[PDB]
């Protein structure tokens, strides 16, 4: 019993998706987490919450893209646990957003490495899938985190309080 | 006389894209034989004739897309006969979808063969070529045709006419 | 045999079948003569799309004889799709002329499809080749006729400026 | 000090980015001076100088886009000198024409090199950009060039003052 | 030689629109330098970079348009290299405004004096041709560039980061 659907498709790259999947669930839960730090009545910046919560939203097609895939080419679907993300309290803005660069740049290397495994085995349709669905999703996720994290540090944040409600206001607001 | 156009083209892709577009051709060829086996009297599925004439319309267009392609790069076209498909009676629904699955995995890895000639020969744009317009569609026709084959053995086919019938009606007649 | 089949004579079925293949041949030549015009150093865009309808038509005349087989309880047998007799097809000019050659062959092959009909007492099989193959024929033959006139008054296909007005005022609208 | 979005971007892919955003300055510069020789009031082309004008504005746009890559990426934007066009003078709208056939295929295997480079220093997200930004726009261009040299020539220019003329209207005023 | 629609163009004239077309593309490829500085990812002033791309879009048709004065006199176009930037890092929002405003009134000084070679030239239509088309528009331009560094300075830029990012949403914005 192999799938009448599979052609071209090593077993490490299956196991690679497998992985991927459960990371990018695993970042949706991470949003997930700090979105709703930033409904605490403590916190209080509505567009901190809803800026996680559309990212965490968004790693959830991510994961569901990836679980389509291996259907697609023949795999079978083993997921994991997902993991708790490694803090409950994100203590600022600034740090969810310093947090969050993090976060994107560890599935941005994990699908580098992905796409290289893909070139090595020579499976040229899952490598254009990860470049045309991954790969510049990544690239504009940390640059745009990476905007986010500069200006919040030159308003002042995290000690100026004024500085992350302004930045809520004026740049999450829309 | 070299092309004025051309640039960074081997012959061997030149005499591998014009291999393809016969392979293309002999696919539409035998799509059009599958479609009007439904129609024959002693058939009668006309969604299957319908879905197989699609089929058999759109493997044109990607033999007439490789031309088209041929020209853009400075190369030149040359055609060859068409092969009469291996079949003039197609056995039933499930047969045929059978058959379809087996002919769109040799296509697929014609396609896969050509996409090693054009990184062994350092040409990106043909690999890209390959990837955006071929590659994704291969995977697609080959998992619905595993789900039409999936479905219609499940439903009792081809043993049952009443499967081959409803299929025809329920889900290619959408 | 079908349980359709009525006054369908044995040589109908075979001749319908070699049709099938003819108009598929000519689909080919068609699409040959399309694409070379879309060739860099031929470069005539209108001339490429003109022929690749031509194609395109050819494509369902061959389809409207394999409905017409299952019809009337025929069987279809598919041949090989024979290569055209060119790769080079030379000039403007010279694809009409060959197109007009090609439709007036096929045009021979239907009226002796029509030949055969009549004398097999098959009305409807008659019918059906005069309504969708005869006059659409004599249309095809007049206008490529014409084509192949106006492209030799212009001084094709000498004059490369012939070709280049042709290409923009007839078969550009 | 490195960027904090820096990830798997070489420092030779860099300089060669650099280096492409001063060639497509370049060439919308020869553009640029093409456009208006057809100005000229003793050469009076209306619709070659639209034409051209269009292709500088969209190198410039081709520019603009590998300074965004750039960024995006963690690299630093070092801008040079935009050397002038090797003419004033283009003599005919053949030869500007031929001109910018030559050029634009100057620059795809300047883009080619781009892409080896990426592959080499395993960077899949830089040739996935110049795959779907660059390569196959450049292939349209040649190719669409080379239509017109060969209408152009095969309609008497540029002795014939009537076939630039004709040209000028049918071809490049539609 | 000499062209035959022109009529009273003095040569230091057409030299002089000459060099002003060398300028304009300079100005616009200082406000390119300065538009995707403010796009770095340690800068990230998003509409500090779209204020100066507007700007680079600017005087790239200020040059397009005396190119076309140039051709409508009878003069000879004849493009020189287009300088770098004199920096490459522009430190600071209120330092880009500030080399914006320095950029605009040498350039204000360049088409100054092209009116007046103008007038004693005894050209009333190129003289016009500048008072229309440029003289005002650099007027204002100078005024809102002042207007700017005033506020930002106001504001407390660039010690205050909070300053030119308020700035950035709600003078730019
Ligand atoms: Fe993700
Ligand atoms: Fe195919
Ligand atoms: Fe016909
Ligand atoms: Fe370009
Ligand atoms: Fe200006
Ligand atoms: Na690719
Ligand atoms: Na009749
Ligand atoms: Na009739
Ligand atoms: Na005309």
Same mark, same amino acid.
């Given at each position: 019993?192999?799938?009448?659907?599979?052609?071209?498709?090593?077993?490490?790259?299956?196991?690679?998706?497998?992985?991927?999947?459960?990371?990018?669930?695993?970042?949706?839960?991470?949003?997930?987490?700090?979105?709703?730090?930033?409904?605490?009545?403590?916190v209080?910046?509505? +567009?901190?919450?809803?800026?996680? @919560? $559309?990212?965490?939203?968004?790693?959830?097609?991510?994961?569901?893209? %990836?679980? &389509? =895939?291996?259907?697609?080419r023949?795999?079978?679907?083993?997921?994991?646990?997902?993991?708790?993300?490694?803090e409950?309290?994100?203590?600022?803005?600034? +740090?969810?957003?310093?947090?969050? @660069? $993090?976060?994107?740049?560890?599935?941005?290397?994990?699908?580098?490495? %992905?796409? &290289? =495994?893909a070139?090595?085995?020579?499976?040229?349709?899952?490598?254009?899938?990860?470049?045309?669905?991954?790969?510049?999703?990544?690239?504009?996720?940390?640059?745009?985190?990476?905007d986010?994290?500069?200006?919040?540090?030159?308003?002042?944040?995290?000690?100026?309080? %004024?500085?992350?409600?302004?930045?809520d206001?004026?740049?999450?607001?829309?």
């Amino acid at each position: 019993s192999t799938s009448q659907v599979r052609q071209n498709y090593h077993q490490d790259s299956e196991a690679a998706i497998n992985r991927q999947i459960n990371l990018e669930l695993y970042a949706s839960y991470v949003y997930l987490s700090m979105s709703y730090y930033f409904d605490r009545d403590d916190v209080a910046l509505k +567009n901190f919450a809803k800026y996680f @919560l $559309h990212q965490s939203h968004e790693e959830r097609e991510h994961a569901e893209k %990836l679980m &389509k =895939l291996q259907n697609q080419r023949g795999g079978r679907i083993f997921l994991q646990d997902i993991q708790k993300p490694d803090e409950d309290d994100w203590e600022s803005g600034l +740090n969810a957003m310093e947090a969050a @660069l $993090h976060l994107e740049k560890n599935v941005n290397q994990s699908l580098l490495e %992905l796409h &290289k =495994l893909a070139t090595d085995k020579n499976d040229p349709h899952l490598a254009d899938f990860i470049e045309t669905h991954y790969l510049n999703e990544q690239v504009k996720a940390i640059k745009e985190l990476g905007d986010h994290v500069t200006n919040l540090r030159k308003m002042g944040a995290p000690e100026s309080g %004024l500085a992350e409600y302004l930045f809520d206001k004026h740049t999450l607001g829309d």
